[PDB]
Symmetry: C2
């Protein structure tokens, strides 16, 4: 058995909301016992995450989204936008540019869904955590 | 072996007494899911339609703890007051509580959220609610009958 089995089941069933939540817990889990205990990840622990765990999560999101979801896709959009997180959030449609945020996040995968729309990372706590995930060696090309 | 004498708000209270607001915020996130029912606990997040089913004593318990240990500068009731003052405009509310800002230096969100309670901390800065999942959940919390005047 692997620790990604529940995430996989959610992804197979196209249950992207539950998959997003399981990805939030998985990120904490693969970051160490200290992160699990306090319930969130210090951005300084992301470099200690093994690339095999991060690639497991990313490959699952890629496989079950036709390559339109995952951290790898988000890194490419992020580079394409000069690593400007503000422009990144607009491009993946987590905010606009007045209604900054929608009433409800759209969790479905259809034709209008932009690349990298998922997984969602809580950038209200600070962009540095997202910055360390996208620039992890796991996602070097 | 005794019956459980702990209450569900004890861990949050201990964090606030120790002024550990980052831990308190994270614990407040779990409590909202917990006080929302077994279904919300199971899936790990709250449907905004379940907020009306939250008992007002639980929400006021959480709010009063945040008020008591922040000199009235933190809590849902305080955020409600700011929210009404701004005609329920969430964008203007997010700017006032400093969850976002509006030459290669512009940061909509900071590198790191500031969890401290000092002189520069704005009213209602905490607790933090993930509005990226949608503004509707925070709206049902801030307008729950628990915080009616």
């Amino acid at each position: 058995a692997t620790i990604f089995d529940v995430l996989e089941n959610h992804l197979v069933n196209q249950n992207f909301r539950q998959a997003d939540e399981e990805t939030r817990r998985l990120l904490i889990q693969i970051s160490g016992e200290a992160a699990v205990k306090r319930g969130y990840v210090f951005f300084s622990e992301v470099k200690t995450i093994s690339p095999e765990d991060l690639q497991a999560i990313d490959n699952l999101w890629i496989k079950h989204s036709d390559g339109r979801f995952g951290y790898s896709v988000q890194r490419k959009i992020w580079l394409k936008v000069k690593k400007d997180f503000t422009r990144f959030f607009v491009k993946v449609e987590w905010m606009k540019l007045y209604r900054a945020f929608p009433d409800e996040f759209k969790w479905e995968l259809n034709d209008e869904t932009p690349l990298g729309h998922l997984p969602l990372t809580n950038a209200l706590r600070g962009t540095q955590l997202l910055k360390c995930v996208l620039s992890h060696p796991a996602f070097a090309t």
